[PDB]
């Protein structure tokens, strides 16, 4: 009905046992995108690394692939201070209280206009969620947000398409059409995904041994008396670097080190030239943030990999060339215990065969793929960070955990595509075969509810001393952190990670 | 009802055994034709080969008598690359 | 029996739903290999990269580990133009 | 078993009511064709009219698509002198007493060798039966015949193939393999086909009226008194050509007239240049024998259409340039009553609009397609002639009766393909990937039985005077017609048609 609400506001979080159910409602506004048209979009030689061919669609899409879309900062604190892990279990999504409005400036209700909503439940469309794009549900529930426009990329050769390039018409899908009295809803069940490691290791991989007992294994301790010899010693509490060990640190893809103290950096523009990159079809792309490696070693917080960390912008940070004070650098220092430092070499290997005439030579391993016995931690998730990514449908993957963090899903939450149904203006009174291009200017607004049930891994720890916990600062300040200022602007002052509790290795 | 949709968007093609079911939805616009009038229309001697007598009506009509109204180019490729023949069986219109 | 066939020629491909059953028959000829002997075979330093030690046996073996042993080119076209994937399920050998 | 017969000799004809069951057994010999190879065969510019692209296969095939394969001359006489029509109903086919022989010259039994037999029951192979080819079962049961080699043609552009050209491997079919103790058999049911008209009409199409009564309809009898006028007369017994009539003679595709008295023919080589032809894809082919038309009119037996009749060769007639005395011309004069004469025009049509200043002009119709009210007879079948043809699988056909006579079948008796299974000679003792080309020289022989049940249309005639019947000549002769001569050669002295009884129109 026109005069009856099609749904209620549901913003809440219920903690019950090993589950937390976050539900969040937001008010959205969907404009008409592309003037109801599908437009081919391209970029040519811009450098070759940035070329693309794709399509802009008249469809919007709903994104809730950030943790702050579901967790309030206090709820995030509850989660990270008390749980060793968490994972999504199921979600329910609702569209309701839809209002389609005609603008001629006067804005009027168009009671008979529709919106079209469908979920790509078969994953037949290019999945553009999981690319850390803007347009997600705002962290602050009172915030009204604009629905982002759906577009996708296909195969390109410069600015040109190839024969394998795919064009998708989203109208070629079954869509529910909704008038102002209608509502849309669907439920989704997450696949069995591993718990995110919401903990930092309280032991280092090279310090898993008893510090009081010698090893019964020997290591080559000396090769020279001086003349050649072979001296063997037992690894013990003092020669702990020489001890036989069962495991290796995780893989390494070395990144350039950048200091937040700019005077310590090289006086050159090396963000791209020295950037750590991968090469794909003659195109260079940053390995950003790349594989999960420790941001820095001990007492080197000022250092970060050049493109090896998630960088969030503070409120009102510039899109381009934001200063360091306008951005929020994350740090994966919690995984120092298992993952190699992002800006350091993995290790040292022999580069030759030493003889009595040739001294042994060593090679510095700046990139190390998977080795047996290697263990590693994934990148941390953040309150502002992504939740899930679609695992690409390929023959093979290795540890398909998304590199910007979160849960890798073969069948992620489906894309929810929404569009204002075009309403033609008055057509001519004589028939014209040409497609109509005169449309009533129109936009829709409504409420969107997303409810996610998360399973929790409770910490079962015998640690005696108190743990590190995320806490708000006790000292006075002009404004409350994670609140609005005097102008009503909600801001997130820092990126809240997830690893505060500790586990043994 | 004014505020309730009377139907959903159904564009799809389902291939099942020896059948393919194409469904296509379009948005149409119908003007007022002829100012609601029936008009006699004619053409005289124009050559005699092109003469006609008929009527223009205030009515529109729905035409879906082209294959691309129902088959996407990919669906057409699926049909023509794999089948020796095809024929329509039934239609539903909304 | 000497005068009775022990099997029929079965070259065919049946496409049924999500399965394709390829059957192929060939005429083979098996000689006597190695004069019924097992022979040690070797290769020495030829470079070291190509050295080997092994045995030649008087046995033959049946190989059908190529796709064209089972798919005609037209069947291969049917498979690759219409399917996102395929995998063997079972085989029978005669 | 090696020492047990796999079937008996069954040559017989049983007449029972409205059915006749012909069964015929023959001894066949199948060589190895093509040295077990499939060979591409072509012919280029030979004229363009004779170009082809195709394949020769190592397979033989069984043909029994001639009436004398099933009917003895006496049985044919029984059929044609007493029945208004007949049609095949079902057939059973048998291969048995197979002997595969090795030739090294000494010929020995190869008891373990096989032949491969299969029927193209799905009509997936090019159907080469119904092209009036040699290699059918011999008319004389004592005659041992060689199995013809199977080959087919596909699309050609000169001697070249096109992308649409089809290659068929007959080994790609399931075949029954038969050793000397095995037999092969299958049954086939003919589709509902019209009875062949085993009768000639005793009335002419233009003489269906009562010769004693005038018509009540008038015809324009005079246009001139002299001055213009309009005089109308009633068609009657004397103005029988002017009478209103309900039907038209069958369609016409005029053929050139040739006299068996060669002195009456033009002194030129016009068999091809004046031949009646159709044009297909830039290729000219004789319309041979073309549509069923009367061979000649009354008292013109010496005349025949140049390529409009079936011509059978007498025994030992030359393949090329056989004299008229060595061939047997058929005659379709029985269909004069309904079909136009093959060498005459269909009729006369107006070519202009007559006025007081322009005299009326007439056009001679030398080719007339189907008109409403047209009736016609098909070509007669002959004891030596074909029985059936496969109706080509097309969107449209008009009166799909085969032009050389017989029954048009959408699903004719399937091709029966037979091949000696290749038996390799001794392979080398070291492996060679190349296909084996050294084979034991081999041929097979056996017996083939084909049983066809024919349905008969009994004549139900009130004709008072005796009918025309096919009869042997009473007068003495050196040899019996349709018998062997002193050398054991069976000969068919004349083509026996089928139309001896009469029906009214």
User: What b/e string do you get for A403-440 counting C-beta neighbours within 10 Å, with b at 16 or more?
Assistant: bbbbbbbeebbbbbbbbbbbbbeeeeeeeeeeeeeebb
CB A347 within 8 A of CB A368: yes
- Residue D159 three-state SS: coil
Placement of tokens 């439940």 in the chain: A121
Three-state secondary structure readout of D278-308: EEECCEEEECCCCCCCECCCCCCCCEEECCC
Q: Does D440 touch chain C (CB under 8 A)?
A: no
Render C42-63 in DSSP notation, one character per residue.
EE----GGG-EEEEE-S-----
Nearest by Cα to D497 from D345, D398, D378: D378
Residue B82: which H helix or E strand, with range?
helix B73-82
Resolution of the solved structure (Å): 2.3
Residues contacting D443, CB < 8 A, separation 6+:
D29, D30, D31, D32, D100, D101, D103, D420
Q: Cα separation of D266 and D319, whole Å?
A: 25
Q: Does B65 touch chain C (CB under 8 A)?
A: no
Residue C13: which H helix or E strand, with range?
strand C12-16
Render D414-480 in DSSP notation, one character per residue.
PPEEEEEPP-B-PPPSS---SPP--B--EEEEEEEEEEEEEEEEE------SPPP------S--SS-
D-chain residues within 8 Å CB-CB of C10?
A: 174
Q: Does C12 touch chain D (CB under 8 A)?
A: yes
CB A59 within 8 A of CB A149: yes
Q: Cα separation of D262 and D424, whole Å?
A: 57
Phi and psi torsions of B42, nearest 5°:
-150, 165
- Residue A472 three-state SS: coil
Number of other CB atoms surrounding residue D47 within 10 Å: 10
To the nearest whole Å, the CA of D435 is away from the closest chain C CA by 10
Nearest by Cα to A109 from A177, A178, A180, A60: A180
Nearest by Cα to D86 from D308, D383, D365: D383
Q: Cα separation of A46 and A42, whole Å?
A: 11
Q: Cα separation of A194 and A191, whole Å?
A: 10
Q: Which of A179, A439, A442 to mutate to test the interface with B (most CBs of B within 10 A)?
A: A179
Give CA separation, D99 vs D6, D27, D105, D112, in Å. Answer: 11, 11, 18, 10
Placement of tokens 């939805």 in the chain: B25
Nearest by Cα to D338 from D195, D464, D208: D208
Nearest by Cα to A107 from A483, A445, A393: A445
Q: Is the peptide bond before C58 cis (omega within 30 degrees of 0)?
A: no
The residues with which A296 forms a beta bridge, in sequence order, are none
Nearest by Cα to A272 from A45, A47, A42: A47
Placement of tokens 């007498």 in the chain: D314
Give Cα D494 distance to the centre of its chain: 16
User: What b/e string do you get for D220-235 counting C-beta neighbours within 10 Å, with b at 16 or more?
Assistant: eeeeeeeeeeeeeeeb
Give the closest of A111, A175, A431 to B2, CB-based.
A111
Render A8-77 in DSSP notation, one character per residue.
----EEEEETTEEEEEEEEEEEE---GGG--EEEEE----GGG-EEEEEEEEEEEB--BGGGT--HHHHH
Do the bridges between strand B12-16 and strand D327-329 make them parallel or antiparallel, or are there none, so unpaired? unpaired
To the nearest whole Å, the CA of A423 is away from the closest chain B CA by 8
HSE at residue D306, side-chain half, CA atoms within 13 A, is: 20
Give CA separation, A428 vs A112, A407, A425, A449, D371, in Å. Answer: 22, 53, 9, 42, 50
Here the tokens at position C28 are 């083979």
Q: Cα separation of A124 and A118, whole Å?
A: 12
The residues with which D273 forms a beta bridge, in sequence order, are none
CB A289 within 8 A of CB A268: no
Q: Cα separation of B83 and D178, whole Å?
A: 36
Here the tokens at position D196 are 């062949």
Q: Given a contact as 3+ CB pairs under 8 Å, which chains touch B?
A: A, C
A385 in a known ligand binding site? no
Q: Cα separation of D97 and D115, whole Å?
A: 12
State the angle between helix axes of B73-82 and C73-82 in degrees (0 to 180), rounded to the nearest 10.
160
A202 in a known ligand binding site? no
Largest CA distance in chain A: 107
Q: Does A174 touch chain B (CB under 8 A)?
A: yes
Q: Does D114 touch chain C (CB under 8 A)?
A: yes
Q: Is the peptide bond before A332 cis (omega within 30 degrees of 0)?
A: no
Q: Does C19 touch chain B (CB under 8 A)?
A: no
Q: Cα separation of D147 and D28, whole Å?
A: 6
Give CA separation, D477 vs A77, D327, D473, D474, in Å. Answer: 123, 20, 9, 9
Residues contacting A438, CB < 8 A, separation 6+:
A424, A425, A426, A427
Q: Cα separation of D81 and D501, whole Å?
A: 6
- Residue D379 three-state SS: coil
D-chain residues within 8 Å CB-CB of C31?
A: 426-429
- Would you put residue B35 in left (φ > 0), alpha (ψ -120 to 50) or beta? left
Q: Given a contact as 3+ CB pairs under 8 Å, which chains touch A?
A: B
- Residue B72 three-state SS: coil
B-chain residues within 8 Å CB-CB of A422?
A: 27
Q: Cα separation of D371 and D252, whole Å?
A: 11
D76 secondary structure, DSSP code = H
Q: Cα separation of D180 and D101, whole Å?
A: 10
Q: Cα separation of A338 and A380, whole Å?
A: 13
Residue B77: which H helix or E strand, with range?
helix B73-82
Q: Does C66 touch chain D (CB under 8 A)?
A: no
Could you tell me which chain D residue has the CA closest to the CA of C30? D427
Q: Cα separation of A311 and A425, whole Å?
A: 46
To the nearest whole Å, the CA of B23 is away from the closest chain A CA by 9
Q: Cα separation of D58 and D420, whole Å?
A: 8
Vertex A146: Cα angle to A144 and A147 (nearest 5)? 125
CB A351 within 8 A of CB A362: yes
Give Cα A142 distance to the centre of its chain: 24
- Residue D365 three-state SS: strand
- Residue A4 three-state SS: coil
The alpha-helical segments, DSSP class H, found in D57-153 are 73-82
Cross-chain residue pair D182–C3, CB shorter than 8 Å: yes
To the nearest whole Å, the CA of B85 is away from the closest chain C CA by 17
A412 secondary structure, DSSP code = -
Largest CA distance in chain C: 56
Give CA separation, C93 vs C7, C20, D176, in Å. Answer: 12, 17, 17
- Residue A264 three-state SS: helix
- Residue A198 three-state SS: coil
Can chain D be said to touch chain A, i.e. do they have 3 or more Cβ pairs within 8 angstroms? no
Q: Does B14 touch chain C (CB under 8 A)?
A: no
Name the structure determination technique: cryo-EM
Q: Given a contact as 3+ CB pairs under 8 Å, which chains touch C?
A: B, D
Residues contacting A383, CB < 8 A, separation 6+:
A67, A68, A71, A73, A76, A139, A492, A495, A496
Three-state secondary structure readout of A360-403: CCEEEECEECCCCCEECCCCCCCCCCECEEECCCCCCCCCCCCC
Q: Cα separation of A442 and A30, whole Å?
A: 9
Render D197-263 in DSSP notation, one character per residue.
E-EEESS-GGG-S-TTS--SSEEEEEEE---EEEEEEE--SS-TTSS--S-EEPPEE---EEESSGG
B-chain residues within 8 Å CB-CB of A171?
A: 9, 11, 25
Cross-chain residue pair B31–A181, CB shorter than 8 Å: no
Here the tokens at position D141 are 């049961």
Nearest by Cα to D183 from D98, D89, D297: D98
Give Cα D46 distance to the centre of its chain: 27
Residue D115: which H helix or E strand, with range?
strand D115-119
Vertex A243: Cα angle to A237 and A245 (nearest 5)? 125
Placement of tokens 């090019």 in the chain: D126
Residues A263, A265, A268, A270, Cα dihedral to 10°: -150
Here the tokens at position D268 are 């030129």
Placement of tokens 């008209």 in the chain: D197
Q: Cα separation of A155 and A163, whole Å?
A: 9
Q: Cα separation of D501 and D463, whole Å?
A: 10
CB D205 within 8 A of CB D337: yes
Give the residue before each break in chain C, using a C-to-N cut-off of over 2.5 angstroms; say none if it is continuous.
Answer: 45
Q: Cα separation of C34 and C30, whole Å?
A: 12
User: What b/e string do you get for D131-159 counting C-beta neighbours within 10 Å, with b at 16 or more?
Assistant: ebeebbbbbbeeeebebbbbbbebebeee
User: What b/e string do you get for B25-54 counting C-beta neighbours within 10 Å, with b at 16 or more?
Assistant: beeeeeeebbeeeeeeeeeeeeeeeeeeee
Nearest by Cα to D94 from D64, D72, D73, D135: D64
- Positive/negative CA dihedral, B86, B87, B90, B93: positive
Cross-chain residue pair A1–B1, CB shorter than 8 Å: yes
Q: Cα separation of A95 and A114, whole Å?
A: 13
Give Cα D390 distance to the centre of its chain: 11
Cross-chain residue pair C72–D424, CB shorter than 8 Å: no
Phi and psi torsions of A444, nearest 5°:
-125, 150
Q: Cα separation of A109 and C83, whole Å?
A: 48
Largest CA distance in chain D: 107
Residues D136, D139, D141, D142, Cα dihedral to 10°: -90
Give Cα D380 distance to the centre of its chain: 9
Can chain C be said to touch chain D, i.e. do they have 3 or more Cβ pairs within 8 angstroms? yes
Render B12-65 in DSSP notation, one character per residue.
EEEEETTEEEEE----------GGG--EEEEE----GGG-EEEEE-S-------
Nearest by Cα to D13 from D3, D24, D2: D24
Cross-chain residue pair A174–B12, CB shorter than 8 Å: yes
Largest CA distance in chain B: 56
Give CA separation, A248 vs A200, A331, A333, C90, D361, in Å. Answer: 18, 22, 18, 42, 108
Q: Does B57 touch chain A (CB under 8 A)?
A: no
Cross-chain residue pair C3–D424, CB shorter than 8 Å: no
């Amino acid at each position: 009905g026109v005069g009856s609400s099609s749904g209620n506001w549901h913003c809440d979080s219920t903690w019950l046992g090993d589950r937390v159910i976050t539900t969040s409602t937001r008010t959205w506004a969907l404009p008409t995108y592309n003037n109801h048209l599908y437009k081919q979009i391209s970029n040519g030689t811009a450098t070759n690394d940035n070329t693309y061919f794709g399509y802009s669609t008249p469809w919007g899409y709903f994104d809730f692939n950030r943790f702050h879309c579901h967790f309030s900062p206090r709820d995030w604190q509850r989660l990270i201070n008390n749980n060793w892990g968490f994972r999504p279990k199921r979600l329910s999504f609702k569209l309701f209280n839809i209002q389609v409005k005609e603008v001629t400036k006067t804005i009027a209700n168009n009671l008979t206009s529709t919106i079209q909503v469908f979920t790509d439940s078969e994953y037949q469309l290019p999945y553009v969620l999981g690319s850390a794009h803007q347009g997600c549900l705002p962290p602050f529930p009172a915030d009204v947000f604009m629905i982002p426009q759906y577009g996708y990329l296909t195969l390109n050769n410069g600015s040109q398409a190839v024969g394998r390039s795919s064009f998708y018409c989203l109208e070629y899908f079954p869509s529910q059409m909704l008038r102002t009295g209608n509502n849309f809803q669907f439920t989704y069940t997450f696949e069995d995904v591993p718990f995110h490691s919401s903990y930092a290791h309280s032991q280092s991989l090279d310090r898993l041994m008893n510090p009081l007992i010698d090893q019964y294994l020997y290591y080559l301790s000396r090769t020279q008396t001086n003349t050649q010899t072979l001296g063997f010693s037992q690894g013990g509490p003092n020669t702990m670097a020489n001890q036989a060990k069962n495991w290796l640190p995780g893989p390494c893809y070395r990144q350039q080190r950048v200091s937040t103290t700019t005077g310590q950096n090289n006086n050159s523009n090396f963000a791209w030239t020295a950037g750590t990159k991968y090469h794909l079809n003659g195109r260079n792309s940053l390995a950003n943030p790349g594989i999960a490696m420790a941001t820095h070693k001990d007492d080197e917080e000022r250092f970060f990999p050049s493109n090896g960390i998630l960088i969030f912008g503070k409120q009102n940070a510039a899109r381009d060339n934001a200063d360091y004070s306008d951005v929020m650098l994350t740090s994966e220092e919690e995984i120092k215990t298992t993952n190699p430092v992002a800006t350091e070499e993995y290790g040292i290997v022999a580069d030759n065969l030493q003889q009595q005439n040739t001294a042994p030579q060593i090679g510095t391993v700046n990139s190390q793929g998977a080795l047996p016995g290697m263990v590693w931690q994934n990148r941390d998730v953040y309150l502002q960070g992504p939740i899930w990514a679609k695992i690409p449908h390929t023959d093979g993957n290795f540890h398909p955990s998304p590199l910007m963090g979160g849960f890798g899903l073969k069948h992620p939450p489906p894309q929810i595509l929404i569009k204002n149904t075009p309403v033609p203006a008055d057509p001519p009174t004589t028939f014209n075969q040409s497609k109509l291009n005169s449309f009533i200017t129109q936009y829709s607004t409504g409420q969107v509810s997303v409810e996610i049930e998360w399973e929790l891994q409770k910490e079962n720890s015998k640690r005696w001393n108190p743990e590190i916990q995320y806490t708000s600062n006790y000292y006075k300040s002009t404004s409350v952190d994670f609140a609005v200022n005097t102008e009503g602007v909600y801001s997130e002052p820092r990126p809240i990670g997830t690893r505060y509790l500790t586990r043994n290795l």
